[model samples]
Target: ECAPMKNGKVCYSDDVEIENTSKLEIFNAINAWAKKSYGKDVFLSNVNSNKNKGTIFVSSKVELLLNDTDKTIIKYKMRITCFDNRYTIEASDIVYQYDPLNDKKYKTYKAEDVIANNGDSNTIALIKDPKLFCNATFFFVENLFADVFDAAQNAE
Candidate 1:
């Protein structure tokens, strides 16, 4: 379930432990993952990592739903903080852009307005079943976390 953080914003986060992996190794692994995942253009603009501090930050968007006639994009900010054999991944500031128009405009909603409180306390009730969006966002963010963990774990 997505919930508010200390700052009262909804976020999805996890702590991953990679046994025997050095901080630098894990950092490099994740950095490589980001670049390969998002491409060089997006990676250059959105990803920021510091080996000295063992932290990586990425602000980017992902395609949530894509079909013949409909498309949705989710924009989010993620942070990975590394320690010896461990790292924490936190994703926040989620926003959804739905159904772009010919004029290049789209309807937008913050995660708080769509998936907060298990979709029971949404500010804008656009969808008849809010749980749909909640589930989609939850699984998407979880998968991203899993991918990063896998990248670090498989690091050579």
Candidate 2:
């Protein structure tokens, strides 16, 4: 579920439980996954880990429907935090790419900007709903957690 911080930015976060694992083990597996999954040129901004905490922040993309006959790109940053047997993934700072009028350019918005001003929508118009967007965002990060849990379980 998404939590509203006092700063007014919304974080869409979800947690997963891992059985029979220590924080160190989880951290190691995450390190390995990051190394294997992301290349040197990948826009992985932060990856910090210790005995008690592990987190990775990355920029990701999604293809969103603009209207019945059109689609656009949605980009956002996501943070994944690892604990002893649980981890949380949160997303924020979303920007949507759209063309306005006849200009083939990009339109930008902070996720908060969309929420506060136009109320849970993308740049263009009446196509993407808040409910659908929330569902898709949660679904995207939750699957990443599942993959990490699988890696942690198999860590030696």
Candidate 3:
């Protein structure tokens, strides 16, 4: 699933614009992209500026705190969806911090007849399956060796 965008270019994100970007910039870029996606129908309340409505589809930030023995996964949880005729908003300060990062070595033999990422139609698996959440673009940089090849080809 490597479909190109309508522009015949990759779907760019701030995460891919590391040269001249920061977290806020990335957030805005992703927000804009999401707006162009299925999330547009839900409004971002100016009253809060960071809220949307619905639970059908969602996006959030993930951070990895480096550690020698154990790595922590810090998750900032926010969700959007509709409840009534009026849009609603909710948020969380909850961070799911987990451990165990580095692995000395490992191996597996699995073949994917297809692949996907960023919920792009090419990577629809990331959006269609909850189990695929653990393998999102925001996660598993180290484990995705083939992704490195794709990234290299696209790199500036």
Candidate 4:
């Protein structure tokens, strides 16, 4: 389950350290990953990069679940900050778009409204399967963080 921060917002974040890596190298690595991952589609909302500052921010949407009929999608913002031999990743501002009616129009719900333990019970009830959404979002973000870490560790 995603933990709530002091401000009552649910966010996922971690710091990763890699030996013998320069800040620029890590920044470049994460920048490349962001471009390759979220650069070429309607899914990509925006990407802001500052090589001098060693920071990259990405806003995008991902299809979290797809079955025969309806699908679930999530929009989120991710930040990657690089320091000497290390980087931190934070993913937040998650919103889900679910079309339970199979009508192609989606209803949006905030992460706190559906994924958090203290989420709105009425919203969860409407979604009908909050657990699945939570699990999919968690795994997707985890995998993305792992991929970014690997990219930085193996920067050329």
Candidate 5:
């Protein structure tokens, strides 16, 4: 069978108000949003033992790497494995971001740093072999913006 494609959302956003700004905080918000949006289409990963190795029982994984403007640079991927059957991996930029309203576009970045981010995540998984936690923000941001659109459409 073909390697499992990134079968779920790979784009998401968050609300960044003043006085609260940090990568770690943004990461948490994104995960919250991601669970709500992608959670419907995909199964959330089980919280395996933090002191132990991670459990790869999920169905799919989405890794997000962004540049300075919250723009995506690269996306790492993995086909979820149930139990310990086989370890499979893939990579791609199948998803890109564009401002649906302002029509503003951000250029994609591909560099050594991009490669580093791809191997890691917005989480604390960079200490090891740089295993990523996938891009949960992608789902969050998409849902967030969609919610705004829905609200506007309903109001007007």
Candidate 6:
């Protein structure tokens, strides 16, 4: 199920099956969570949802909280598609905005555009410390989608 985007770059994806669930129920669950999770400092954009043939699709941009300082901003597009008993989640086009110092000279980058030669498409951004970056990025993506699936199952 690894599909590439327009630039032939694979995006990060995860899927889960919640037995005894329906598409509308899953959608309702996700919508509720979205309402509760977004707003104020966290801005959501380009949200769109549709349903057909017992399947539901939803997309949005979420400003991910990478750290507690609130200085760094990382926003990613989240696409979720669901069936009666299963759902798939994907994150793409990660945009990172960070200020390396006290000044407001923050820099931003699209994951693919920044790491063209790195070989791994899921690597969100470039940092001097590769291990730390990998760890935090994995943590962010893992918990981010894990909660989405939980929200799906938490619905009925």
Which candidate's TM-score is highest? 4
Ranking by lDDT: 4, 1, 6, 2, 3, 5
RMSD (CA, angstroms), candidate 6: 5.0
TM-score result, candidate 6: 0.68
Q: Rank the candidates by TM-score, best first.
A: 4, 1, 6, 2, 5, 3
Q: Count the backbone clashes (under 3 Å) in each candidate.
A: 0, 0, 8, 0, 6, 0
Residue pairs in steric clash, candidate 2?
none
Candidate with the greatest lDDT versus the true structure: 4
In order of appearance, the predictions have TM-scores of 0.84, 0.62, 0.21, 0.88, 0.21, 0.68
Candidate 1 structure quality by residue, lDDT tens digits, 23-136: 888888998898777646653338777877989888887666533444467788899998878889999998887654423366888878777788887776445555666777
Q: Which stretches of model 4 miss by more than 4 angstroms?
A: 2-6, 66-70, 118-122
Enumerate residue pairs that collide in model 3. Answer: 53-80, 53-81, 54-80, 54-81, 54-82, 55-81, 116-123, 117-123
What C-alpha lDDT does candidate 5 achieve relative to the native structure?
Answer: 0.30
* lDDT, model 3, position 35: 51
* Candidate 2, 1-156: lDDT as tens digits: 422323566555667677767767666777677656653535533444344447765666656654455544667676777777766667667655645442546666555544433344434353345444444445554566677667767654
lDDT of 3 by residue, 25-129 (tens): 333433443455435434421111353322322434344443333333333333333222222222323233332223523222111211223233323232233
Reference-based lDDT, each prediction: 0.77, 0.57, 0.30, 0.78, 0.30, 0.58
Against the true structure, candidate 4 has what lDDT?
A: 0.78
What ranges in model 5 sit over 4 Å off?
Answer: 1-134
Each prediction's RMSD to truth: 2.9, 4.5, 18.4, 2.4, 17.0, 5.0
Cα deviation in Å at residue 50, candidate 4?
A: 0.6
Which regions of candidate 2 fall more than 4 Å away from where they truly are?
A: 1-7, 40-53, 61-68, 100-104, 115-138
lDDT for each residue of candidate 4 in 1-156, tens digit (9 for 90 to 100): 543444666698989988887888888888988887777764457888988789999998877774455568789998999998889999999888888885768888888888777333425677776666666777888998999987887775
